[PDB]
Amino acid sequence: VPKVTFTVEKGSNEKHLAVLVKYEGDTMAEVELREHGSDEWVAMTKGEGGVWTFDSEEPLQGPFNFRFLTEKGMKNVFDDVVPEKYTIGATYAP
């Protein structure tokens, strides 16, 4: 029963996209973030220390897509995770 959920952490400011991917249970290994037409899946960047952030380059910022790699060894793609006008302080995912 795959039911994960992220959380746009405060890490987001200018062009940062932080997420508090954590639903208790499994473990944290690595995370991969997408966009729409950037350049295929792009492994996140553990720069926040507690969460995963992403530096956007394009002027447009629509929905995102994730597919962590839990230490346990279980991946899964996620579409329509974050909305259009996301608000840092909520959850957006399947």
Side-chain angles (χ1 to χ4, degrees), residues 5-78:
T5 41
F6 306 75
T7 343
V8 179
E9 288 306 86
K10 209 137 188 181
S12 329
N13 30 62
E14 318 300 279
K15 36 60 143 184
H16 293 69
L17 209 294
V19 286
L20 216 180
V21 51
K22 238 238 279 79
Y23 48 95
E24 226 222 89
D26 238 29
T27 340
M28 306 117 60
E30 213 242 33
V31 190
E32 180 99 5
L33 159 67
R34 227 198 120 192
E35 280 205 293
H36 65 106
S38 161
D39 55 11
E40 244 139 284
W41 291 98
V42 283
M44 260 261 182
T45 306
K46 60 211 307 239
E48 252 276 51
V51 293
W52 329 128
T53 23
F54 184 74
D55 62 331
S56 217
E57 262 250 69
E58 59 231 36
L60 302 142
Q61 269 120 290
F64 299 112
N65 310 258
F66 284 80
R67 44 115 49 227
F68 46 69
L69 325 170
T70 54
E71 313 204 309
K72 209 273 117 192
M74 298 192 70
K75 319 83 144 238
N76 252 338
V77 179
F78 311 105

